């Protein structure tokens, strides 16, 4: 029941060794950054 996938799947030799693939439309890499926290005070009553 599948003829063509529109999902941005990866291209590897194990997957492309048995099927034909087209050229990618967007080259993006993998990242490991989650989130950042900025330490600050809201009240700020000096003498800290």
């Amino acid at each position: 029941q599948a003829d063509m996938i529109v999902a941005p799947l990866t291209i590897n030799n194990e997957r492309a060794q048995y099927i034909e693939f087209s050229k990618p439309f967007k080259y993006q890499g993998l990242t490991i950054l989650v989130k950042k926290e900025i330490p600050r005070s809201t009240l700020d009553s000096f003498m800290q």
């Binding site: 990866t10 439309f25 967007k26 993998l30 990242t31 490991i32 950054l33 926290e37 809201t42």
Partner: protein, 223 residues
């Protein structure tokens, strides 16, 4: 000391002149040191708890208290399977992983997991949509996302020409232009003046306390 102005005379004695000179100098020293500590507080050193770049040395070393749980049963397993370089970490990162994307993205923001290994494709959309995450600058381990069809399908050339013409006219610029919303934060130290009013109100409440204390002072005066 507090730099005030009246105008009724001046100390004629030289002792109060030298004492007033060294006292004004001490006032300049304490206000210049207070301003210097304020500017030193503005910037902040912070420059800590950051990342590495294209390869984090903490990924090669196994850690039990900081599990790098990623997506289970996906393309990251194939990428970690077809490699040969980082082979001493596939056994550690192979166990204790989530097979759902919403469970991982919700877990890393709902205080559950420590980190995650996933491409920036969904990270830039969830970060640019929920306004809770932030992406980095470098993009290590680049990959391409293409469309795969059957070998006996002659329409792959026509669809390929539709993709090429779709990228030559400017339709991709309209899709990426209308599907990528540039929202506000870009770094952890780019706008240090977005508050101010709270930092000034924290002293304003003490000014009001000094006004009530002044009401107590005039209460002593009328007594």
């Amino acid at each position: 000391l507090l730099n005030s102005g009246l105008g009724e005379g001046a100390p004629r004695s030289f002792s109060a002149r030298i004492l007033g000179m060294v006292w004004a100098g001490f006032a300049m020293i304490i206000v210049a040191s207070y301003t210097a500590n304020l500017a030193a507080f503005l910037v902040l050193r912070r420059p800590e708890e950051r990342i590495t770049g294209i390869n984090d040395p903490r990924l090669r070393n196994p850690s039990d208290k900081f599990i790098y749980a990623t997506v289970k049963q996906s393309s990251v397993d194939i990428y970690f399977r077809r490699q040969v370089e980082l082979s001493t970490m596939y056994r550690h990162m192979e166990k204790h992983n989530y097979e759902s994307a919403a469970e991982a993205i919700q877990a890393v923001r709902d205080n559950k997991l420590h980190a995650f290994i996933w491409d920036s494709a969904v990270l830039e959309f969830e970060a640019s949509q929920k306004c809770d995450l932030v992406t980095t600058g470098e993009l290590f381990f680049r990959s391409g996302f293409g469309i795969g069809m059957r070998k006996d399908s002659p329409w792959k050339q026509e669809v390929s020409l539709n993709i090429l013409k779709s990228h030559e006219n400017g339709f991709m610029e309209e899709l990426d232009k209308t599907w990528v919303r540039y929202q506000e934060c870009d770094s952890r130290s780019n706008a240090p003046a977005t508050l101010t009013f709270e930092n000034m109100a924290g002293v304003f409440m003490l000014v009001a306390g000094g006004i009530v204390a002044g009401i107590f002072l005039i209460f002593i005066e009328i007594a």
